[PDB]
């Protein structure tokens, strides 16, 4: 920590002008329009608009299920009408005993919605393999993602999980993108991207919106209260699906790293680069011109958090977040914090980092947990605390 570099962050209260931003009416009016601008030509990419009408079908609904605590339903939404099409399935819990619509926490799922519980009664879905083939999954992996969403912990606090398995949106290798939805939206004649058009994080996050779009319809759901969870690159698909839905009363961002929560100046661009190469689809073609510092990034993560502003953002991360940086995550959070405080609310608290185990913040939080790279009990023990401080 003593070899990582020196660096002043680009200011996020002033305007590019240099002008100050002065109140919550300026942000609003004059720098965030700035800020998502910047993120969705530089970074993420431009995305379609919100489709007029939502295609979709209520597959199933099943009352008593896991063992009577949940109502569950399995919701597809079509991204086009043509057949074999992309499209998408939702997986909701409702707590059985749900007096009124319900809170919900959506998620992007790493895994089909068979991994989310050990629930029988969910079809075994089509997964990616290591092999960059799409096959049906194994019996054995029912329920191997049911750790990192503990939906017992949810449905008792009273709250309902949805989630998406994200691939189905976009395959996840490079390549993917043919059997996604990005194509559904090229031009006549186009075939490939512009520098400046979404690439797959952000189409991550656009389907996260389209599931958005099903939840206010429902009528066992408070459509006034979700909030949306993301872990590792799918947390960098939720900075930005909350950026660009208001919607989303709070954000969780677990763990997720460069282009996500994390400051980048805490390198010379190498991650970026990392990133760029490994997963040429994540980011937007202009992105790859800040590979190892080559332009200098007019912008950093404190910028892409204030987005959030004056809604909710839960920060975490892991002592080994593999060798991804939660001191940076922390620094994301605590320079995204005095936006909010532009709008009477409280962020952080703080610029010095937490210990582990020691949660800090209010509308803005973020903690440190011992562990590996993952989402655990512990994440969502703070993540529900989180929910009901931003809900009641």
């Given at each position: 920590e003593a070899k990582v570099p020196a660096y002043t962050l680009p200011?996020?209260?002033?305007?590019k002008s240099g002008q100050?931003?002065?109140?919550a009416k300026s942000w609003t009016t004059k720098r965030r329009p700035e800020i998502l601008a910047i993120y969705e030509a530089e970074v993420y990419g431009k995305s379609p608009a919100r489709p007029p009408k939502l295609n979709y079908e209520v597959k199933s609904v099943e009352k008593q299920a896991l063992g009577g605590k949940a109502t569950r339903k399995i919701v597809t939404i079509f991204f086009?009408?043509?057949?074999?099409?992309p499209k998408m399935d939702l997986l909701l819990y409702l707590p059985?005993?749900?007096?009124?619509?319900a809170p919900v926490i959506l998620g992007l799922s790493?895994?089909?919605?068979?991994?989310?519980?050990?629930?029988?009664?969910?079809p075994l879905a089509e997964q990616w393999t290591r092999d960059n083939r799409k096959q049906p999954s194994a019996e054995?992996?029912?329920?191997?993602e049911a750790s990192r969403w503990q939906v017992e912990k949810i449905l008792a606090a009273g709250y309902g999980l949805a989630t998406v398995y994200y691939e189905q949106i976009?395959?996840?290798?490079?390549?993917?993108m043919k059997y996604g939805?990005?194509?559904?939206?090229?031009?006549?004649?186009?075939t490939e991207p512009e520098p400046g058009d979404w690439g797959a994080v952000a189409a991550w996050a656009w389907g996260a919106s389209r599931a958005m779009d099903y939840l206010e319809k429902d009528?066992?759901?408070?459509?006034?209260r979700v909030g949306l969870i993301g872990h590792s690159r799918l947390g960098k698909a939720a900075i930005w699906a909350g950026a660009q839905d208001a919607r989303f009363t709070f954000i969780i961002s677990n763990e997720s790293g460069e282009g996500g929560?994390?400051?980048?100046?805490?390198?010379?661009?190498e991650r970026t680069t990392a990133l760029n190469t490994r997963?040429?689809?994540?980011?937007?073609?202009?992105?790859?011109?800040y590979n190892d510092r080559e332009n200098e990034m007019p912008f950093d993560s404190h910028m892409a958090l204030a987005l959030m502003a004056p809604r909710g953002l839960y920060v975490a991360s892991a002592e080994g977040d593999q060798w991804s940086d939660p001191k940076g995550e922390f620094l994301g959070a605590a320079n995204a914090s005095p936006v909010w405080e532009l709008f009477g609310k409280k962020g952080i608290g703080t610029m010095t980092m937490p210990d582990l185990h020691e949660p800090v913040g209010d509308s803005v939080r973020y903690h440190i947990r011992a562990g590996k790279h993952d989402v655990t009990e512990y994440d969502w023990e703070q993540y529900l605390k989180f929910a009901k401080a931003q809900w009641g």
């Open positions: 200011a996020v209260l002033a305007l100050p931003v002065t109140d086009s009408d043509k057949p074999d099409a059985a005993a749900a007096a009124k619509p790493f895994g089909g919605i068979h991994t989310v519980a050990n629930d029988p009664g969910v054995k992996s029912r329920g191997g976009e395959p996840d290798f490079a390549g993917g939805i990005r194509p559904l939206f090229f031009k006549p004649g186009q009528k066992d759901v408070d459509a006034r929560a994390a400051i980048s100046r805490r390198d010379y661009g997963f040429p689809h994540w980011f937007d073609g202009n992105y790859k011109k």
